[PDB]
Amino acid sequence: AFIIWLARRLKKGKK
Amino acid sequence: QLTEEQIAEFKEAFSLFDKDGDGTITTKELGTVMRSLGQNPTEAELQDMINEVDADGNGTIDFPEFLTMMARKMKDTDSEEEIREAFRVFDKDGNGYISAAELRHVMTNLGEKLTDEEVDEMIREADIDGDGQVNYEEFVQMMTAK
Ligand SMILES: [Ca+2]
Ligand SMILES: [Ca+2]
Ligand SMILES: [Ca+2]
Ligand SMILES: [Ca+2]
């Protein structure tokens, strides 16, 4: 599921 | 320590994964996404993973459960099994090299829309030689980062 976090990590930076 | 930003991320991320938006994650939903990664795991592997993440084993994973799962994958990110599974899943072509197109396709297939920049940041930062591709060795090292 780490995949979900992977996106959140980059997505969090975008925000 | 859950910050407002982190909570908002779950709401947006969770809403993205949950098509119906019932506030619950089913096997068909996660399974479909988990398969889109170019992988074809059996229900046993999926169900087993869910059970390990489902503190109550109700057959579905709630937002709270996801948070716990993250702590495991984030804390145990140094697990050979977790890394091996991620490496194989990421490298759908099994070329042993992770590209921006492949990564973007994976991280995106997560019901999220990431720009070429985001993916580039992950690879660019993971690419020690800046060859535009991340090798297993570089992946393992980047899989231990907090
Ligand atoms: Ca749902
Ligand atoms: Ca549950
Ligand atoms: Ca590949
Ligand atoms: Ca490299």
Short mmCIF file of C-alpha atoms and ligand atoms in Angstrom, two decimals:
data_model
loop_
_atom_site.label_atom_id
_atom_site.label_comp_id
_atom_site.label_asym_id
_atom_site.label_seq_id
_atom_site.Cartn_x
_atom_site.Cartn_y
_atom_site.Cartn_z
CA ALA A 1 0.00 0.00 0.00
CA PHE A 2 3.08 2.19 0.41
CA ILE A 3 2.05 3.30 -3.07
CA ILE A 4 -0.62 5.52 -1.60
CA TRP A 5 1.93 7.23 0.61
CA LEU A 6 4.34 7.59 -2.27
CA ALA A 7 1.85 9.83 -4.04
CA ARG A 8 1.02 11.71 -0.86
CA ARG A 9 4.69 12.52 -0.31
CA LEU A 10 5.08 14.21 -3.69
CA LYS A 11 1.53 15.53 -3.70
CA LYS A 12 2.07 17.06 -0.26
CA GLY A 13 5.03 19.03 -1.63
CA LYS A 14 3.00 20.26 -4.60
CA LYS A 15 0.34 21.72 -2.33
CA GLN B 1 1.30 13.80 15.18
CA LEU B 2 -1.32 14.29 12.46
CA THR B 3 -1.22 17.83 11.07
CA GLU B 4 -4.12 19.56 9.33
CA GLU B 5 -2.24 19.16 6.05
CA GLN B 6 -1.85 15.42 6.58
CA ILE B 7 -5.53 15.03 7.48
CA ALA B 8 -6.54 16.97 4.37
CA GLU B 9 -4.32 14.67 2.33
CA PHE B 10 -6.24 11.62 3.53
CA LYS B 11 -9.58 13.22 2.79
CA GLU B 12 -8.49 14.06 -0.75
CA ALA B 13 -6.47 10.89 -1.27
CA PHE B 14 -9.11 8.68 0.31
CA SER B 15 -11.86 10.33 -1.71
CA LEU B 16 -9.82 9.62 -4.83
CA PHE B 17 -9.47 5.92 -4.03
CA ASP B 18 -13.10 5.60 -2.95
CA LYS B 19 -15.07 6.05 -6.17
CA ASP B 20 -18.44 5.87 -4.41
CA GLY B 21 -17.07 7.86 -1.48
CA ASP B 22 -18.73 5.67 1.16
CA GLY B 23 -15.83 6.41 3.50
CA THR B 24 -14.64 2.80 3.20
CA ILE B 25 -12.12 0.96 1.01
CA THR B 26 -13.29 -2.32 -0.52
CA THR B 27 -11.19 -5.13 -1.99
CA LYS B 28 -12.46 -4.46 -5.51
CA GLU B 29 -11.37 -0.83 -5.25
CA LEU B 30 -7.91 -1.37 -3.80
CA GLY B 31 -7.55 -4.62 -5.71
CA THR B 32 -8.30 -2.90 -9.01
CA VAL B 33 -5.71 -0.20 -8.33
CA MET B 34 -3.24 -2.72 -6.92
CA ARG B 35 -3.60 -4.64 -10.19
CA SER B 36 -3.32 -1.62 -12.48
CA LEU B 37 0.29 -1.48 -11.29
CA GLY B 38 0.91 -4.13 -13.93
CA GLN B 39 0.79 -6.79 -11.22
CA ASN B 40 -1.50 -9.82 -10.99
CA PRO B 41 -1.52 -11.00 -7.34
CA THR B 42 -4.01 -13.59 -6.08
CA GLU B 43 -6.81 -12.80 -3.64
CA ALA B 44 -4.72 -14.63 -1.05
CA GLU B 45 -1.96 -12.03 -1.29
CA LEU B 46 -4.44 -9.15 -1.34
CA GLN B 47 -6.75 -10.53 1.34
CA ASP B 48 -3.73 -11.43 3.46
CA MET B 49 -2.35 -7.91 3.12
CA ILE B 50 -5.72 -6.40 3.98
CA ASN B 51 -6.10 -8.62 7.03
CA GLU B 52 -2.67 -7.51 8.22
CA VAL B 53 -3.77 -3.90 7.72
CA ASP B 54 -7.30 -4.48 9.00
CA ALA B 55 -7.00 -4.24 12.78
CA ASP B 56 -10.56 -5.57 12.97
CA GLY B 57 -10.53 -7.75 9.85
CA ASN B 58 -13.95 -6.53 8.74
CA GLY B 59 -13.00 -7.19 5.11
CA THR B 60 -12.59 -3.47 4.41
CA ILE B 61 -9.93 -0.88 5.26
CA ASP B 62 -10.93 2.43 6.83
CA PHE B 63 -8.95 5.67 6.71
CA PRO B 64 -7.64 5.10 10.29
CA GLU B 65 -6.40 1.65 9.28
CA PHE B 66 -4.55 3.14 6.33
CA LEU B 67 -2.71 5.46 8.68
CA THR B 68 -1.51 2.49 10.71
CA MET B 69 -0.50 0.62 7.58
CA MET B 70 1.55 3.63 6.51
CA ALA B 71 3.43 3.62 9.78
CA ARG B 72 4.32 -0.01 9.12
CA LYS B 73 5.45 0.46 5.52
CA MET B 74 7.09 3.74 6.48
CA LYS B 75 8.73 2.29 9.59
CA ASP B 76 9.53 -1.10 8.05
CA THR B 77 10.32 0.49 4.69
CA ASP B 78 13.64 -1.26 5.29
CA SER B 79 11.94 -4.62 4.71
CA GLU B 80 13.40 -6.75 1.92
CA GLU B 81 9.97 -8.20 1.16
CA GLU B 82 8.35 -4.77 0.97
CA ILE B 83 11.17 -3.39 -1.16
CA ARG B 84 11.24 -6.45 -3.40
CA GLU B 85 7.48 -6.26 -3.92
CA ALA B 86 7.66 -2.54 -4.67
CA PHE B 87 10.64 -2.93 -6.98
CA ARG B 88 8.95 -5.66 -9.02
CA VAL B 89 5.67 -3.74 -9.11
CA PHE B 90 7.40 -0.52 -10.14
CA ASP B 91 9.48 -2.27 -12.79
CA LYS B 92 6.58 -3.61 -14.83
CA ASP B 93 8.92 -4.06 -17.79
CA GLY B 94 11.30 -5.93 -15.49
CA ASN B 95 14.16 -3.99 -17.08
CA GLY B 96 15.67 -3.24 -13.67
CA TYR B 97 15.40 0.50 -14.37
CA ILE B 98 12.75 2.95 -13.15
CA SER B 99 11.82 5.72 -15.59
CA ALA B 100 9.66 8.82 -15.18
CA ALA B 101 6.98 7.41 -17.48
CA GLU B 102 6.82 4.13 -15.58
CA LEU B 103 6.88 5.74 -12.15
CA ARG B 104 4.37 8.41 -13.12
CA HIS B 105 2.11 5.67 -14.43
CA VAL B 106 2.35 3.83 -11.11
CA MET B 107 2.13 6.68 -8.61
CA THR B 108 -0.63 8.18 -10.76
CA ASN B 109 -2.60 4.97 -11.25
CA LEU B 110 -3.19 5.52 -7.53
CA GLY B 111 -6.22 7.64 -8.41
CA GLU B 112 -3.96 10.69 -8.08
CA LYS B 113 -2.77 13.20 -10.69
CA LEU B 114 0.95 13.98 -10.42
CA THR B 115 2.87 16.31 -12.71
CA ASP B 116 6.06 15.37 -14.56
CA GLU B 117 7.83 17.48 -11.94
CA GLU B 118 6.75 15.36 -8.98
CA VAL B 119 7.94 12.13 -10.58
CA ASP B 120 11.12 13.87 -11.72
CA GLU B 121 11.74 14.96 -8.13
CA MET B 122 11.46 11.41 -6.82
CA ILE B 123 13.76 10.02 -9.51
CA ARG B 124 16.04 13.04 -9.81
CA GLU B 125 16.55 12.86 -6.06
CA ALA B 126 16.86 9.07 -6.19
CA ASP B 127 19.17 9.13 -9.20
CA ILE B 128 22.65 9.32 -7.69
CA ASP B 129 24.32 9.39 -11.11
CA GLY B 130 21.45 11.39 -12.63
CA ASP B 131 21.19 8.83 -15.43
CA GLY B 132 17.47 9.59 -15.52
CA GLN B 133 16.81 6.12 -14.11
CA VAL B 134 16.81 4.58 -10.63
CA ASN B 135 18.44 1.19 -10.10
CA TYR B 136 17.60 -1.39 -7.44
CA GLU B 137 20.55 -0.24 -5.34
CA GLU B 138 19.33 3.35 -5.50
CA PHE B 139 15.77 2.19 -4.84
CA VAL B 140 16.76 0.32 -1.68
CA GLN B 141 18.63 3.34 -0.36
CA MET B 142 15.67 5.58 -1.17
CA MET B 143 13.38 3.04 0.48
CA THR B 144 15.05 3.56 3.86
CA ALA B 145 14.57 7.33 3.95
CA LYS B 146 12.02 8.58 6.48
CA CA C 1 -15.77 2.47 -1.37
CA CA C 2 -11.45 -2.70 8.97
CA CA C 3 11.02 -0.52 -15.39
CA CA C 4 20.88 5.91 -11.36
#
